[PDB]
Amino acid sequence: NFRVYYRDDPVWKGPAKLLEKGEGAVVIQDNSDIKVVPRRKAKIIRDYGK
Amino acid sequence: CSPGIWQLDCTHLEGKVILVAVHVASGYIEAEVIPAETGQETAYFLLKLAGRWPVKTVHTDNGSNFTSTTVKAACWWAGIKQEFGGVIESMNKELKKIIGQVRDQAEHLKTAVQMAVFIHNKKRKGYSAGERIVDIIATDI
Amino acid sequence: SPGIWQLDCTHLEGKVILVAVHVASGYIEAEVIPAETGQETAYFLLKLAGRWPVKTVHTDNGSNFTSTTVKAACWWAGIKQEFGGVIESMNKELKKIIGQVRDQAEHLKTAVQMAVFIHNKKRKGYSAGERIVDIIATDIQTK
Amino acid sequence: NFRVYYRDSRDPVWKGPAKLLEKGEGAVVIQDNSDIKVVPRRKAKIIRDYGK
Ligand SMILES: Cc1nc2ccccc2c(-c2ccc3c(c2)CCCO3)c1[C@H](OC(C)(C)C)C(=O)O
Ligand SMILES: Cc1nc2ccccc2c(-c2ccc3c(c2)CCCO3)c1[C@H](OC(C)(C)C)C(=O)O
Ligand SMILES: [Mg+2]
Ligand SMILES: [Mg+2]
Numbered sequence: 001n002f003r004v005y006y007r008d009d010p011v012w013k014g015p016a017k018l019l020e021k022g023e024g025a026v027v028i029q030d031n032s033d034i035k036v037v038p039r040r041k042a043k044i045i046r047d048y049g050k
Numbered sequence: 051c052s053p054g055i056w057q058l059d060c061t062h063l064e065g066k067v068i069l070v071a072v073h074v075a076s077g078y079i080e081a082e083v084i085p086a087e088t089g090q091e092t093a094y095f096l097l098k099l100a101g102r103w104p105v106k107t108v109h110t111d112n113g114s115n116f117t118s119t120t121v122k123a124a125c126w127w128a129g130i131k132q133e134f135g136g137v138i139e140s141m142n143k144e145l146k147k148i149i150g151q152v153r154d155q156a157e158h159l160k161t162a163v164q165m166a167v168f169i170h171n172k173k174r175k176g177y178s179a180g181e182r183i184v185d186i187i188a189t190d191i
Numbered sequence: 192s193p194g195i196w197q198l199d200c201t202h203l204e205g206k207v208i209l210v211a212v213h214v215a216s217g218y219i220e221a222e223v224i225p226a227e228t229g230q231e232t233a234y235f236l237l238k239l240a241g242r243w244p245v246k247t248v249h250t251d252n253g254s255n256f257t258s259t260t261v262k263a264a265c266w267w268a269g270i271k272q273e274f275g276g277v278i279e280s281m282n283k284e285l286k287k288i289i290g291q292v293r294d295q296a297e298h299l300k301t302a303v304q305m306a307v308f309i310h311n312k313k314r315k316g317y318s319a320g321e322r323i324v325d326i327i328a329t330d331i332q333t334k
Numbered sequence: 335n336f337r338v339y340y341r342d343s344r345d346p347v348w349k350g351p352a353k354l355l356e357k358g359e360g361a362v363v364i365q366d367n368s369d370i371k372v373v374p375r376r377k378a379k380i381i382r383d384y385g386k
Contacts, residue, residue, distance in 0.1 A: 049129030101308035168241035188328030269385025
């Protein structure tokens with residue numbers, strides 16, 4: 001349902017899988033790497049068109 | 051082929067970037083002159099296209115704008131599958147041919163581009179491409 | 192009538208949004224244009240006329256819609272112009288949807304196109320995007 | 335079949351539509367409300383009713 005695009009390198013990475021969401025950060029998994037990303041550095045996007 | 055398959059590619063004239071989409075089953079096209087051949091401009095073009103038609107799959111070459119993160123985001127949101135790797139290339143040539151035929155009727159290249167899109171989509175074979183896409187999609191409803 | 196469109200501009204964030212509505216269906220297209228001029232309106236019209244069978248465009252008397260360049264585009268494309276609340280209602284609907292999704296996008300124009308998508312795809316029992324294709328196809332398939 | 339929009343009288347506002355009488359190399363001959371005018375090509379925009 002959700003994919004996350006994010007920054008570390010000024011190019012946006014993704015789609016990363018969304019594991020958990022907090023008010024300040026999101027926990028995501030790209031390939032075999034779990035990252036804690038600030039909310040300002042993350043774009044959570046729904047597959048609205050499905 | 052499926053009523054939901056589109057091919058996209060860029061061509062170039064007068065130093066400007068022309069982004070072209072073709073509905074494979076009908077030959078219907080849409081095009082825009084974009085200020086730079088970037089993922090951002092391509093993603094914006096796709097969001098507009100997906101709002102008009104039932105865009106299920108887009109096939110492109112591996113141009114960096116087509117493999118970009120922003121295009122991935124747009125296709126995810128709109129529900130578009132991307133496939134990578136000659137209909138649009140043949141269509142690019144035809145579009146440039148029509149543009150050259152009408153170029154001196156317009157000041158700006160983008161004006162001649164949209165005239166050529168109109169001419170291509172309205173020309174009846176018989177149905178025109180513009181009639182074919184609507185007929186194909188309505189039958190798929 | 193299958194060929195009647197209404198066009199109008201509305202404004203958000205200091206930017207100009209040019210909106211076209213296919214009256215019979217409720218289908219819309221929109222662009223954020225850099226200025227509310229006849230030049231930009233004529234270019235938008237040439238694009239619209241290439242996609243759909245645009246026979247008549249109804250607008251208010253905004254100077255961009257009465258402009259010489261728009262009259263030139265309508266002459267080339269074969270469009271009849273009529274001057275003087277479907278589009279007004281649609282401006283308010285589009286702005287409502289934009290407001291609902293605005294924080295999901297950096298650029299206003301991205302939110303605009305998300306809002307056009309949302310409006311055109313939402314089913315009532317067809318969507319507006321289904322209605323325009325059905326209406327135009329029926330005209331073609333029965334001639 | 336053709337309409338001409340043009341600028342004259344040192345006015346940036348586009349006038350017309352006028353009737354096209356001749357498209358020359360450097361000037362166009364037009365008729366606007368029975369007035370015959372000769373305008374430089376660069377001050378004339380000649381547009382065909384392609385959409386019919
Ligand atoms: C700059 C410009 N100035 C004009 C001044 C007076 C009258 C018409 C124009 C046109 C024009 C408009 C519609 C049109 C065509 C040309 C040519 C045939 C199709 O319809 C343009 C065109 O530019 C815009 C379309 C962006 C306004 C152009 O590039 O030539
Ligand atoms: C600037 C920008 N940067 C990004 C960086 C990484 C990932 C995505 C984006 C998106 C984006 C793309 C498609 C999309 C949505 C947002 C939101 C949902 C619909 O699909 C944008 C958008 O801008 C462009 C569309 C011009 C690229 C935006 O305005 O936010
Ligand atoms: Mg290419
Ligand atoms: Mg208005």
